[PDB]
């Protein structure tokens, strides 16, 4: 019987700062136990200061990014070159995904950029289009290895003030871009060690009021 889905592996990571956001993804593409590519970009600048990744089935991920990129083009045409806001982008993507409710895109989607107040925004979706704004989100293969680390090292969970014996929680502060990139790099070093589908390369897209910057880091190739 023909199976129209596959699994291309990989893992992605979205972190919202105060006046920036990052969307990172390994550049490894796999099927079963074979490597297809050591550098197949998965995180895309979609214009309007929005970065997007659809991790899972690369055919479905590529199709969705393509359709959303088109949606941004047709929004400029239809609404007088108006900037598509991240909250509006997320609602459009909910409709793109839910459109295929009874033959889903097998992807976990994260988008990132700034909200209309200039603050860092991360939104994450299920395959069938359910979605929430979040300070943190890992998706794909190593999501279970990375999320817990981010609950601890981004929203200071299960961390208390020493000598308050659990009365006072560690106060939740915004992180520098330098501190966020460190938690991203450490997340993908850890993920590469303990997951066979993650490795080769790390690509980070950083979104500020000045635009989209890229950083690349080598990962272990085994």
């Amino acid at each position: 019987q023909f199976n129209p889905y596959g699994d291309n592996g990989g893992t992605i990571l979205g972190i919202a700062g105060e006046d920036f956001a990052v969307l990172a993804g390994d550049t490894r593409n796999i099927t079963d136990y074979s490597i297809n590519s050591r550098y197949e970009p998965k995180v895309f600048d979609c214009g309007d200061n929005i970065v997007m990744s659809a991790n899972g089935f690369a055919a479905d991920g590529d199709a969705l990014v393509k359709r959303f990129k088109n949606s941004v083009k047709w929004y400029h045409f239809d609404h007088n070159d108006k900037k598509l806001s991240i909250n509006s982008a997320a609602r459009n993507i909910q409709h793109l995904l839910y459109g295929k409710r009874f033959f889903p895109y097998y992807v976990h989607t994260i988008i990132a950029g700034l909200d209309e107040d200039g603050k860092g925004a991360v939104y994450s979706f299920d395959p069938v289009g359910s979605y929430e704004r979040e300070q943190c989100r890992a998706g794909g293969a190593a999501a279970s290895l990375i999320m817990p680390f981010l609950d601890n090292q981004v929203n200071f969970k299960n961390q208390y003030e020493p000598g308050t014996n659990g009365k006072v929680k560690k106060p939740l502060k915004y992180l520098s871009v330098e501190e966020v990139i460190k938690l991203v790099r450490d997340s993908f070093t850890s993920a590469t060690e303990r997951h066979i589908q993650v490795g080769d390369g790390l690509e980070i897209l950083i979104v500020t009021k000045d635009g989209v910057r890229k950083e690349f880091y080598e990962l272990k190739r085994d």
Binding site: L145, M147, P148, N152, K157, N158, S190
Partner: protein, 204 residues
């Protein structure tokens, strides 16, 4: 249906500078229903500690079995079984049921009384030994425990730092599994003193 995830729960162990730690959540559920907040998964035979995750009936049966086996070991050898040897006894004992296994994820931790060397080990359900230096994880939130440990863990931690690291690795792993949590215990083990701590964690 999948016996290893009816009751739920997790164990983790870690090595430090002349010490080990082993910790477990306290949950026993029947799938969605929480039943008990007091189901400890870490037992001890002399100075050797065994954590066991999986089907709770088997957790209990294996603990009853290894108590039995280490008691006779001690009467005949005239000394307490050491961690290395007990590890072989667990592996032997599980492999005996190769075609009818105990649905468990055992974890051994303890200090060799003669070499002073910290020791940890884990096993699949048919007794394949994993003897990592760094850390061992087991249970319904194993994926999570691997993620927390691999990022948090550094070698040669002092007992009071190690306590923080294994506590934070377990707590944050458990908050991301529906079938773990409901309380937690951490054992800090040195060559001749063992501190047992109950952790304050969320009850959902």
């Amino acid at each position: 249906s999948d016996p290893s995830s009816i009751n739920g729960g997790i164990v983790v162990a870690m090595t430090g500078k002349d010490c080990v730690a082993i910790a477990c959540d306290l949950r026993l559920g029947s799938q969605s229903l929480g039943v008990s907040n007091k189901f400890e998964k870490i037992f001890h035979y002399g100075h050797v500690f065994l954590g066991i995750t999986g089907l709770a009936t088997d957790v209990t049966t294996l603990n009853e079995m290894f108590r039995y086996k280490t008691n006779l070991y001690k009467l005949k050898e005239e000394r307490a079984i050491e961690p290395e040897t007990f590890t072989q006894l667990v592996s032997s004992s599980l492999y005996e049921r190769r075609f009818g296994p105990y649905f468990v994820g055992p974890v051994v931790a303890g200090i060799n009384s003669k070499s002073g060397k910290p020791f940890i080990a884990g096993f699949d359900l048919i007794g394949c030994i994993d003897e990592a230096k760094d850390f061992i994880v087991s249970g319904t939130a194993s994926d999570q425990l691997f993620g927390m440990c691999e990022s948090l863990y550094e070698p040669n931690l002092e007992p009071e730092d190690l306590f923080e690291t294994i506590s934070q690795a377990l707590l944050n792993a458990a908050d991301r599994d529906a079938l773990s949590g409901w309380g937690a215990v951490v054992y800090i083990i040195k060559k001749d003193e063992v501190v047992k701590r109950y952790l304050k964690m969320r009850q959902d």
